[PDB]
């Protein structure tokens with residue numbers, strides 16, 4: 001497993017998120033490295049899930065391609081017969097560094113930020129359900145009465161947050177502009193509905209998802225950026241066992257979650273997962289990848 005990338009200053013680090021290490025390649029280009037780190041109850045585990053970041057990188061790439069005729073994206077085009085390593089300093093091809101980067105790294109164009117977490121919810125769960133139980137609203141938006149936990153909304157809804165506080169679409173328009181916010185909300189719902197319909201047919205319900213969007217202002221054009229419709233950016237549910245009126249198991253994280261709670265380790269830093277938990281969680285990522293892409297992992 002790749003837990004933390006160590007590139008010895010060959011490229012400068014921009015950020016380390018929960019799961020992604022980002023490096024600056026040049027003035028216009030970034031390198032997004034998905035590690036095998038995993039989070040639960042808002043803390044990362046001490047050890048990692050081997051090849052998780054390769055699986056989620058490939059899943060994100062799958063969705064980018066699936067949506068390529070719906071939305072422009074930030075991916076740098078790799079010439080045929082070339083690899084990402086051809087676009088990186090020569091040192092990064094040395095075995096010490098190539099092992100940390102291969103199959104889990106994406107070369108991306110820097111675009112102008114749209115500073116919103118563009119969340120779309122097809123089903124009422126998570127912080128939407130919590131609010132709705134209290135006040136019958138979701139991100140301050142008025143909702144129909146009588147919704148049950150995990151129920152599908154009449155239509156998927158744009159419910160933004162700021163990097164995390166849940167905000168209304170009207171606040172999103174204050175933050176990024178009235179016209180832009182509307183275009184963003186409309187595109188997000190469209191992209192979500194298309195992918196959700198496809199995933200459900202494959203047996204996975206994507207309950208909600210967090211997109212990040214950018215803008216190429218030289219051509220006023222919305223760009224799909226960040227990771228796309230993975231179990232880290234979205235809520236994956238088993239479609240066959242779906243039941244309204246209760247919480248659904250996390251498709252990818254329930255085995256881990258169950259272990260943590262059983263040991264009162266939820267929210268605790270520095271927790272090492274036992275091997276059985278690691279192995280089963282890994283197998284769950286492979287299954288999601290194979291189910292959604294149609295590709296075989298390891299065969």
Ligand SMILES: Nc1c(C(=O)N[C@@H](CC(=O)O)C(=O)O)ncn1[C@@H]1O[C@H](COP(=O)(O)O)[C@@H](O)[C@@H]1O
Nearest residue numbers: 039040041042043126127208209210232233234235
């Ligand atoms: N909430 C997450 C999370 C997350 O918290 N993951 C846990 C992992 C876990 O315990 O399951 C972590 O430890 O960070 N990741 C993404 N999203 C996305 O955020 C969108 C809104 O989620 P909310 O919880 O506010 O309904 C919603 O569209 C997405 O689900």
Ligand SMILES: N[C@@H](CC(=O)O)C(=O)O
Nearest residue numbers: 072073074075076077109
């Ligand atoms: N390939 C273009 C995007 C596109 O062709 O849609 C870019 O990297 O900016």
Ligand SMILES: N[C@@H](CC(=O)O)C(=O)O
Nearest residue numbers: 173176177178179180181
């Ligand atoms: N029409 C927006 C500008 C934008 O969409 O960026 C505004 O409220 O100024």
